[PDB]
Design a protein around this nucleic acid. Structure first.
Ligand SMILES: [K+]
Ligand SMILES: [K+]
Ligand SMILES: [Mg+2]
Ligand SMILES: [Mg+2]
Ligand SMILES: [Mg+2]
Ligand SMILES: [Mg+2]
Ligand code: NA
Ligand code: NA
Ligand code: NA
Ligand code: NA
Ligand SMILES: [Zn+2]
Lengths: 183, 270, 50, 173, 196, 130
RNA sequence: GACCGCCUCUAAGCGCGCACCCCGCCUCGCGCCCCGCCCGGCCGCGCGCCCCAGCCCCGUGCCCCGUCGCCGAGCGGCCCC
RNA sequence: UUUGAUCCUUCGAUGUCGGCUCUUCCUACCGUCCGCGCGCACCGGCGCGGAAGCGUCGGAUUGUUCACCCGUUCAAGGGAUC
RNA sequence: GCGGAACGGCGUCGGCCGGUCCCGACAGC
C-alpha cells in the first residue's frame, strides 16, 4: 500500500507463539521451533489469534518483505503442528546402490554408486531423521519440524551423488526428491 | 622485447638473505602442537653429530620392486649424552602472543651451567645466583612459585643443559635449551610432571622411539665468500669472454633504474 | 530403470532452457537469463536415446 | 521562491491600427524583471510582437492568503536532451506561488530541467474527488496517521554542538 | 587530561577526522576496542579494496615500503596518519600523543569513556546499507589474534559485571549522604537560579 | 512498537528554524515532508514547516477538522495537554534551558565558581562517607 | 521464497565450491619480555553492559589541569643495570 | 607487439642489427585446474566463463628476426630506450 | 562516480498515448 504495506495470517488453536524484537517462537505438540528476523525492518503485532506484518514507507524492494515473512511464519506453524516428510528415490541402471542408515537415523552411508570405490557419508542436520521406506522398495524418508533443515539435507544428498565427465542426458543415476508434504 | 625461450629462475627466494647465522646454535622455532588427553611426554633433545655408515635392511613394502629383498642404506650417528633438567618456565596466551609468567630455578645448579653464565670462568667473580640459592634452600619458595605457574600459565617448558665432559669436545660450558611438555589433562598435571624430574638426568631413550620420524635443526658447513656460479648455480659464459666468464652477463634492464633483489650476486656461502 | 524413474531423472537433468549468450541453466518458463539478463533463450537439446 | 504577477501589454499604436488589442498573462517569477522578460518571451512567439514594437502597461504583484491546504494540478512542457515533452503534475500546498516552487524543485531534481527550459501552460486547483496521482490522493483522506519519517535527524543535529557524550543517545519514537 | 573513546559502532573515516582535529589542538586521545569499528559496504568489496591496496610495493626492494599493517589498531593508526602532516615537527608531535588498542587493556580499563554520536553507524547509514567490522577484514588479511582478543574481552566483561553491584550500593549511599548534607544544598539552590 | 504519530492535533516541539524552542500544534498534513502548524498561545504563527524541524510529543489535543486561528485558540485553552507537558521531565528541562538562554559574561564567571565548589563538595562527601 | 494470487537460485535469508588469493610450516628480524647481579628513582588519579522497526520512558551530563587540586593505600606507566 | 604520416626534444655525439647470459611484468589462455554447452553412447573432438601457479624443449640450413623440416612429455602470444 | 560508441537491462524513480474492468477484467462460455 502507498503509506504502509501489511499482511495478516491466522494462528491455529493447537499452536501457541510469542513475539519479541523480531524473534518468533512457536510451540506445538511436535516440539518447539525458533527463528530470527532482526535482519529486516518490520512491525509484527499479535492481536486476537492473528499475526500481522507491516512495513512503513514501502519504497523499492521493501515491498517484498511482509509476504515472505508471513510464509516463513506459516511454515513454522505447519511444522510444529505436524512435521514435514521428504521422500527420495534411488535411480540406477546396472549397479544397485546400497544405502545404510547409521547413528540412530542421524546419518547415512551410500556405497557402490556407479560401482565406484569411495563411499559417501552425509549427516542429517539437527532435528532431521533418515530411514528407509518399509512399504516402497528403494526409498528414503526424512522427517523434521523445520522445512529448511530437511530440504537442505535432501539437497546435500543429491549433490553428493553426481556422475563426472559424461553425458548427463544419458547417464541418469542418483537420488531425486519425488515428494514434499506433511503427515 | 620478450625472452625467446622458457626457463625458470635459479635458486629459492624463500631463503633470503644468505647471511651468516647470528643465532648461537640451531634453535627450535616451533614445537609440536599439544593435544589434550594424550600421554604426557617431552618433545625435543640436543646432541652432537658423530659420523655416517652403512646398514643392510630387509624391505617389506607392498607394491614396490623392493618388497621382498635387501637394500643398502646410508645412516647418520648422533651422540646423545644425558641432559639435566634445572628450571621450569610457564607462558600465558595473550592478545599480544605468548608471554612468560615466571621461571623457577632449582636449588642447586651444576658447574657447566654456571660456566655458561660467564665468558672467562677462571677470572670472573662468582656471583650468579648467589642470593637466589640462599632463599631457595627450603622448598617453600619453589612451592609458591609453582602455585603461581599452576594458576596462571597455559604452556609449560623445562630447561635442560648438556654435559660436555661426556664427549670428546674441547668446550666446557654447556648448552641450555627449553623443552616443551605435551599431553596430560590439565596444566596442573604438566606442572607436577615437570617438577618430578628437576635436578635429574633425562635419557634420549625416554623421548624418541625407533621407527618414528624426527626433524633435525643445525647450521650448515661454511665456505666464506663465494661467486655466483657456485653460490646460485648460474650458467658459465663461453670461452672467448673478455675479463673472465664466471658471472652473470646482464644484471638488469634500463628501467627500473636500480638493481632488483632477485638478481644473483656474490657473497657469503654456507 | 522403470519408465517412471527415467521421468524423474529427466525432469532433473533434461528439461530446462539455455541462454544463447552465456550458456546458463534457466527455468522452464523464464523470459530473462538469470545471469546476463538477456532474452535470447533456447531449449536444451534432446538426447537421441529418447 | 516564486511570486505571481499579472502583466498587461500592447503593441504601440500605428497609423493603420490606432488602438491595438491588449493582452493579459499570468506569470510566476522571482522578481518583476524576470516577469517582464517571460511576458515578452511568450508574446513574441504567440502574437509576433517583440519588445521593440510594443509596451508593457502594468505589472501588478498579487499576494494570496495561505491558511488551508489545496491540491494544485500543473500542466507544462519542457525540453530534454532529445526533444520536448508534455507533463501533468499534482502538488499539495497552501498557495499557488508555493506550489510552483515545489514543481520547479521536483523538475530540477528528477528531470534536470531548469527555469528557462520549462513552459507553464496552466495552473488550477483540484478537488479531493478528482485527484490523479496516488501520493496526493493518499494524503487527501481523513484520519491519516504515520510515524515520524526521520527521527534520527533530531539526534544527529544535536551531536554537532555536543561532540563528546557519555552515552549513545536513543531515538525516541 | 586524556580523552578515551570507545570505538564500537563508529565509522572509521569520520572518527579519524574528529581525532585528527583533536590531536592537532594539543589533546591526548586513546582509542580502545578498535576491532569493533565499522566500514560501510559489502564484505566482498571491502576485502577486494584492501587486497588491492596490499599489492603496491617497491619493485626493486620490498623492504623500502610501503608497509601494510594487518592488525586493526595499526590500520586505524595509518588511517589517522593519512589526515595529518606527519613529516613536520608539528605533525610528528601530534602522532606521538595518540594511542590505539585492540580490546581494553589494563592500562586503560580505569578511564571514563566517551563517544561521538556524529560518527556512529546507527545514525550515519540507512538501514539497508551493508556494513562490516574491521576485525573481520583484518582476520581475512592476516591478523592472528582475533580469538585471543575475544577470550580476554569475555573474561574482562564478566569481571566488570561483578563490579557493578558494589558501585550500585556505594552510589546509593553517597546520594543519600549528599541529600542530607547542608552545604551542598546552598550551592544547588544558588545554581538553580541560573538554570543549572 | 510506535507510540507517537504525525496526526492532526499532535503537540510538537520546534528544535530548529527561526522559531526553535517553542511548542505548537499540527493542524494539517501536506506530505511526508511538511506539515501545517500553529501555536496561538505559545508565540508561533500559522505556517508550513518540514518535519525535520518538529519533534513529536506524547500529548494530543482534540481539535476540529479545519479550525481557524481564533477557533483553535479557545480549543487549546479548554484543554490540559499544555499544562501537563510542562510539568513532565521534558518540560522542566525545557524551562531550565530557557533560563540558561539569558546569560552574560559576568554570570559565566559566577556559574563557573559555583561549579568548582560543587565538584569540591562532591569529592569531600564521597570520601567522608562511602 | 516474494515484489507480480502462478512460476522463479535472489530481493531479504541459507548451503557447496577452483593448479588462483590469504594464513601456517620455513628464512631474516627492529624492538620487547622473563630470570640472574641489584632490589633503586620518577610520574598520573578517571571503569556498568547491550540494542536502535521498543527507542523501557529518553530529546543528558562534563564544561576549573589550578582557576587551589597535590598525604597514604591501591592501580597504571616510565627510567637505570 | 606491423608499416606509414608528421618533424615536438637531441647534431660542443644518449655507442647504431642479431645471438649468448639474466631478471621481472602483461593477458587478448596453448597444456594442466574448476564449471556449463554440443550435431556430447564410450574413446576423441569443438564452443563459452573464471583462472597468469607451473610448463612451453633438442637438432639440420640461414648473420638473420622470420621461415622451413626432423625428433620428443606434441610445444600461446607479447613488453621492459625495437 | 574508469575517456568512450553501436547495441542490450523485469535496477529504481517519473511520464505520454492506447485498450479491457464489480453488466466480474488480469493470473490461477
Ligand atoms: K619467458
Ligand atoms: K645527436
Ligand atoms: Mg676478445
Ligand atoms: Mg650512456
Ligand atoms: Mg656519452
Ligand atoms: Mg579474461
Ligand atoms: Na623515475
Ligand atoms: Na611447504
Ligand atoms: Na614499440
Ligand atoms: Na635495443
Ligand atoms: Zn545468459
Amino acid at each position: 500500500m502507498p503509506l504502509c504495506s501489511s499482511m495478516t495470517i491466522k494462528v491455529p488453536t493447537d499452536v501457541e507463539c510469542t513475539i519479541n524484537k523480531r524473534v518468533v517462537t512457536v510451540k506445538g505438540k511436535k516440539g518447539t521451533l525458533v527463528r530470527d528476523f532482526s535482519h529486516a525492518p518490520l512491525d509484527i503485532t499479535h492481536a486476537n489469534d492473528t499475526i500481522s506484518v507491516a512495513v512503513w514507507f514501502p519504497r523499492g524492494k521493501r515491498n517484498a518483505l511482509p509476504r515472505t515473512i508471513c510464509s516463513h511464519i506459516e511454515n513454522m506453524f505447519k511444522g510444529v503442528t505436524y512435521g514435514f516428510e521428504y521422500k527420495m528415490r534411488l535411480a540406477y541402471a546396472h549397479f544397485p546402490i546400497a544405502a545404510t542408515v547409521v547413528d540412530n537415523n542421524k546419518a547415512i552411508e551410500i556405497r557402490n554408486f556407479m560401482h565406484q570405490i569411495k563411499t559417501r557419508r552425509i549427516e542429517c542436520l539437527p532435528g532431521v531423521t533418515i530411514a528407509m521406506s518399509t512399504n516402497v522398495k528403494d526409498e528414503l524418508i526424512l522427517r523434521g519440524i523445520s522445512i529448511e533443515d530437511v530440504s537442505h539435507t535432501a539437497a546435500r544428498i543429491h549433490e553428493s551423488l553426481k556422475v563426472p565427465n559424461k553425458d548427463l542426458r544419458k547417464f541418469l543415476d542418483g537420488c531425486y526428491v519425488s515428494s514434499r508434504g506433511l503427515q | 622485447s620478450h625472452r625467446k625461450f622458457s626457463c625458470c629462475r635459479k635458486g629459492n627466494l624463500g631463503y633470503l638473505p644468505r647471511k651468516r647465522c647470528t643465532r648461537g646454535r640451531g634453535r627450535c622455532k616451533t614445537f609440536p602442537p599439544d593435544v589434550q588427553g594424550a600421554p604426557i611426554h617431552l618433545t625435543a633433545f640436543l646432541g652432537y653429530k658423530a659420523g655416517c655408515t652403512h646398514v643392510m635392511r630387509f624391505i617389506d613394502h607392498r607394491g614396490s620392486n623392493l618388497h621382498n629383498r635387501q637394500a643398502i642404506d646410508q645412516a647418520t650417528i648422533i651422540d646423545a649424552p644425558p641432559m639435566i633438567c634445572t628450571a621450569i618456565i610457564g607462558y600465558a596466551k595473550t592478545p599480544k602472543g605468548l608471554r612468560a609468567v615466571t621461571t623457577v630455578w632449582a636449588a642447586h645448579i651444576a658447574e657447566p651451567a654456571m660456566r655458561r653464565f660467564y665468558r672467562n670462568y677462571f677470572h670472573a667473580e662468582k656471583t650468579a645466583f648467589s642470593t637466589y640459592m640462599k632463599k631457595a634452600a627450603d622448598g617453600t619458595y619453589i612451592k609458591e612459585q609453582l602455585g603461581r605457574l599452576k594458576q596462571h600459565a597455559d604452556v609449560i617448558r623445562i630447561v635442560a643443559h648438556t654435559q660436555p665432559a661426556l664427549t670428546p669436545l674441547k668446550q666446557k660450558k654447556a648448552d641450555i635449551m627449553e623443552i616443551q611438555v605435551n599431553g596430560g589433562a590439565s596444566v596442573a598435571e604438566k606442572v607436577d610432571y615437570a617438577y618430578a624430574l628437576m635436578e635429574k638426568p633425562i635419557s634420549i631413550k625416554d623421548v624418541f622411539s625407533v621407527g618414528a620420524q624426527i626433524d633435525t635443526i643445525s647450521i650448515t658447513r661454511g665456505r666464506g665468500f663465494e661467486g655466483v656460479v657456485t653460490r646460485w648455480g648460474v650458467t658459465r659464459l663461453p670461452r672467448k669472454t673478455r675479463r673472465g666468464n664466471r658471472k652473470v652477463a646482464c644484471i638488469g634492464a634500463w628501467h627500473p633504474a636500480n638493481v632488483q633483489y632477485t638478481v644473483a650476486r656474490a657473497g657469503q656461502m654456507g | 530403470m522403470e519408465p517412471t524413474l527415467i521421468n524423474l531423472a529427466r525432469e532433473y537433468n533434461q528439461n530446462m532452457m539455455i541462454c544463447r549468450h552465456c550458456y546458463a541453466r534457466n527455468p522452464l518458463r523464464a523470459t530473462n537469463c538469470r545471469r546476463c539478463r538477456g532474452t535470447n533463450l533456447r531449449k536444451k537439446k534432446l538426447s537421441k536415446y529418447a | 521562491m516564486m511570486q505571481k504577477y499579472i502583466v498587461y501589454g500592447r503593441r504601440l499604436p500605428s497609423e493603420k491600427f490606432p488602438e491595438p488589442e491588449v493582452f493579459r498573462m499570468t506569470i510566476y517569477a522571482p522578481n518583476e524583471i524576470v516577469a517582464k522578460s517571460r511576458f515578452w518571451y511568450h508574446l513574441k512567439s504567440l502574437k509576433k510582437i517583440k519588445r521593440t514594437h510594443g509596451e508593457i502597461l502594468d505589472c501588478q504583484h498579487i499576494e494570496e492568503n495561505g491558511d488551508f491546504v489545496k491540491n494544485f494540478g500543473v500542466l507544462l512542457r519542457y525540453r530534454s536532451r532529445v526533444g520536448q515533452h508534455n507533463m501533468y503534475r499534482e502538488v499539495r500546498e497552501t498557495t499557488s506561488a508555493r506550489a510552483m516552487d515545489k514543481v520547479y524543485s521536483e523538475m530540477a531534481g528528477q528531470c534536470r530541467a531548469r527555469y528557462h527550459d520549462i513552459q507553464i501552460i496552466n495552473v488550477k486547483e483540484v478537488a479531493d474527488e478528482d485527484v490523479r496521482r496516488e501520493k496526493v490522493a493518499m494524503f487527501t483522506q481523513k484520519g491519516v496517521r504515520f510515524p515520524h519519517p526521520c527521527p534520527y535527524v533530531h539526534v544527529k543535529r544535536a551531536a554537532r554542538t555536543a561532540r563528546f557524550q557519555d552515552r549513545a543517545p536513543h531515538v525516541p519514537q | 587530561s586524556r580523552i578515551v573513546i570507545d570505538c564500537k559502532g563508529h565509522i572509521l573515516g569520520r572518527l579519524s577526522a574528529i581525532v585528527a582535529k583533536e590531536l592537532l589542538h594539543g589533546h591526548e586521545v586513546a582509542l580502545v576496542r578498535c576491532e569493533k569499528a565499522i566500514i560501510s559496504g559489502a564484505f566482498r568489496d571491502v576485502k577486494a579494496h584492501y587486497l588491492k591496496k596490499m599489492h603496491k610495493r617497491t619493485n626493486f626492494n620490498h623492504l623500502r615500503g610501503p608497509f601494510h599493517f594487518r592488525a586493526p589498531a595499526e590500520i586505524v593508526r595509518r588511517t589517522i596518519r593519512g589526515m595529518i602532516p606527519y613529516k613536520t615537527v608539528r605533525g610528528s608531535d601530534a602522532m606521538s600523543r595518540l594511542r590505539v588498542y585492540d580490546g581494553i587493556p589494563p592500562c586503560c580499563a580505569r578511564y571514563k569513556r566517551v563517544v561521538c554520536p556524529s560518527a556512529m553507524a546507527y545514525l550515519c547509514l540507512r538501514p539497508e546499507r551493508r556494513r562490516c567490522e574491521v576485525g573481520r577484514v583484518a582476520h581475512e588479511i592476516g591478523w592472528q589474534h582475533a580469538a585471543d582478543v575475544e577470550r580476554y574481552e569475555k573474561r574482562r566483561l564478566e569481571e566488570c559485571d561483578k563490579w557493578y553491584q558494589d558501585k550500585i550500593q556505594i552510589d546509593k549511599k553517597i546520594a543519600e549522604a549528599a541529600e542530607k548534607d547542608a552545604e551542598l544544598q546552598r550551592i544547588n539552590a544558588e545554581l538553580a537560579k541560573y538554570g543549572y | 512498537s510506535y507510540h507517537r504519530f504525525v496526526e492532526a492535533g499532535r503537540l510538537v516541539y520546534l528544535g530548529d528554524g527561526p522559531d526553535k524552542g517553542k511548542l505548537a500544534v499540527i493542524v494539517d498534513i501536506l506530505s511526508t515532508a511538511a506539515v501545517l502548524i500553529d501555536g496561538p498561545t505559545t508565540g508561533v504563527k500559522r505556517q508550513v514547516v518540514s518535519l525535520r524541524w518538529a519533534m513529536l510529543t506524547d500529548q494530543v489535543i482534540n481539535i476540529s477538522e479545519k479550525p481557524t486561528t481564533e477557533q483553535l485558540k479557545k480549543e487549546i485553552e479548554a484543554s490540559p495537554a499544555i499544562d501537563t507537558f510542562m510539568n513532565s521531565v521534558w518540560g522542566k528541562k525545557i524551562q531550565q534551558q530557557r533560563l540558561r538562554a539569558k546569560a552574560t559574561f559576568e554570570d559565566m564567571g559566577k556559574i563557573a565558581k559555583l561549579r568548582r565548589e560543587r565538584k569540591m563538595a562532591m569529592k569531600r562527601i564521597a570520601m567522608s562517607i562511602k
